[PDB]
Every structure is written in structure tokens, then in C-alpha cells.
Design a protein around this ligand. Structure first.
Ligand SMILES: N[C@@H](C[C@]1(C(=O)O)C[C@H]2OCCC[C@H]2O1)C(=O)O
Length: 256
């Protein structure tokens, strides 16, 4: 039989979440969400079963000064996993070290904050000195700021980096908690801002999208699966299945 594929992933609502049950759940049955449905579809099309393993360090992946990676990206580089199926952003720096499938979703960075301030943009946020801001540590949003040559974003990176201990949060849940409980705005991918702001009416998006990019399935460079997964993703795209999956997991509007 085809070897069971190892899937690296990360907890991130509504992509990957713990299923609620009053009885024991084991293995893949512990998880549900958009990415689990995606795996069910992809595996049907490609003819494999899989083992879902949460990334040990709880990170998406960034490289340090030595050029060393962490998170799901490192799991792929080191061939610890066959596939990464998560809200994993397709980026230039990552594409040089892993293979991505074609995108299954598009999005852009924006700002999550509480309601009631005059901040209307990243420019406004960088200029003012009352509200702190940051991003999830060792994700693509952090990297966007680190690599930016746009002045506002260079300043925002210097600020985040100077206050890294508090400004760069461990994960999105910590970021949202910091937004809700302190004077802190989180730079966050838009599809997740859409999800949370329809669930917690104290939260809002500030400004528009700062960039535009996609999520893709990650594989190690040279993987024989990448092209097959790309073909399957295009099938799901064209058949309207990706759209249906988004509707299923984001439904539906809960706030004014
Ligand atoms: N998709 C990003 C991770 C992350 C970001 O760096 O913006 C953190 C996490 O934050 C909540 C939205 C989904 C995720 O995006 C990445 O692939 O590194």
C-alpha cells in the first residue's frame, strides 16, 4: 500500500481545531476544520491516507540570521513531514526552500483592534504612540515587516523588533487576547480578521489590506506530491468545492 503521509499542521481556527466530543478521540479524529476537509478531498483525489501531527514548536516558520528555519517550514526542509496543510502563506523566501502547491485561498495583512479609536490605517497606527502593535512571532506577517522597504512598515518593524518580548506574540490566540485586554493592535491575515470579527463584536478590522498573497500546501523541495496536489487543488477550485468549504467554516455574519 501507499506509504501513510505525514502531515504537519498547526492549531488555527477555523482551519484546524480540536473536535468537541464527550467520548475519546484518537489520531486524526481529534481534529476538524477547513484544512481537515481539504485533506479529505485531496487524499481522495490522490489516493493516500495520512497522519496529522501538530508542529512541535507551534510555529509557521521563519529563518534566523544564520539562515536556519523553524516551524512547519523546517519540518518540510528536514523531511519530517510529507505535506504541510495549514493556512501557510506562499512567500518568496519560503518558495526558495520548500515547494508550494498553487494557492487554495487568497488574503492580505490587515489590522485587528478594538472599536472606538480614530486609527484608520497602518500609517495612523505607526504614527500614534498610545496603542502598541505587533504580529505572531515567526510567521509571514512578521517577515513581511522585517523585509519591507516601505518607510511606514520599516518603522513598524523597528518598533515591533524593539519591543519583541511583548509585541511579537506566540500565536494568534495570544494576539487576540492582547487586543481584547490591553492597548494593542494585531497585524493579522484578513481571512482570520473576517472570522473573528463576525464572532466577537468588540473586535474590528482597521484599514484595508496591506498586501495580497495566497495560502498553499507545502512540500519538501523536489517532492513528487507537489504537482499532484496542485492539480487536485485546481480541480477543487474549478468544481466550486474550495468556495463551499470556505462558506461551511466561516458561516455566518454575527455582528453589526
Ligand atoms: N499564515 C502565516 C501565519 C500567520 C501570520 O503570520 O499572519 C499567523 C496566524 O495568525 C492568524 C491568521 C493565520 C496565521 O497567519 C504564515 O504562513 O506564516
Amino acid at each position: 500500500a501507499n506509504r501513510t503521509l505525514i502531515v504537519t499542521t498547526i492549531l488555527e481556527e477555523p482551519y484546524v481545531m480540536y473536535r468537541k466530543s464527550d467520548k475519546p478521540l484518537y489520531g486524526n479524529d481529534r481534529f476538524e476544520g477547513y484544512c481537515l476537509d481539504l485533506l479529505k478531498e485531496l487524499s481522495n483525489i490522490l489516493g493516500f491516507i495520512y497522519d496529522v501531527k501538530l508542529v512541535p514548536d507551534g510555529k509557521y516558520g521563519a529563518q534566523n540570521d544564520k539562515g536556519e528555519w523553524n516551524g512547519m517550514v523546517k519540518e518540510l526542509i528536514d523531511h519530517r513531514a510529507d505535506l504541510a496543510v495549514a493556512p501557510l502563506t506562499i512567500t518568496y523566501v519560503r518558495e526558495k526552500v520548500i515547494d508550494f502547491s498553487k494557492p487554495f485561498m487568497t488574503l492580505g495583512i490587515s489590522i485587528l483592534y478594538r472599536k472606538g479609536t480614530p486609527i484608520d490605517s497602518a500609517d495612523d497606527l505607526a504614527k500614534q504612540t498610545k496603542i502598541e502593535y505587533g504580529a505572531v512571532r515567526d510567521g509571514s506577517t512578521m517577515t513581511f515587516f522585517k523585509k519591507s522597504k516601505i518607510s511606514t512598515y520599516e518603522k513598524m518593524w523597528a518598533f515591533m523588533s524593539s519591543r519583541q518580548q511583548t509585541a511579537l506574540v506566540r500565536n494568534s490566540d495570544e494576539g487576540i487576547q492582547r487586543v481584547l485586554t490591553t492597548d494593542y493592535a494585531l497585524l493579522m491575515e484578513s481571512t482570520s480578521i473576517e472570522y473573528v470579527t463576525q464572532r466577537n463584536c468588540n473586535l474590528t478590522q482597521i484599514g484595508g489590506l496591506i498586501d495580497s498573497k495566497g495560502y498553499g500546501v507545502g512540500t519538501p523541495i523536489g517532492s513528487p506530491y507537489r504537482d499532484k496536489i496542485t492539480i487536485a487543488i485546481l480541480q477543487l477550485q474549478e468544481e466550486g468545492k474550495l468556495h463551499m468549504m470556505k462558506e461551511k467554516w466561516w458561516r455566518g455574519n454575527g455582528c453589526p
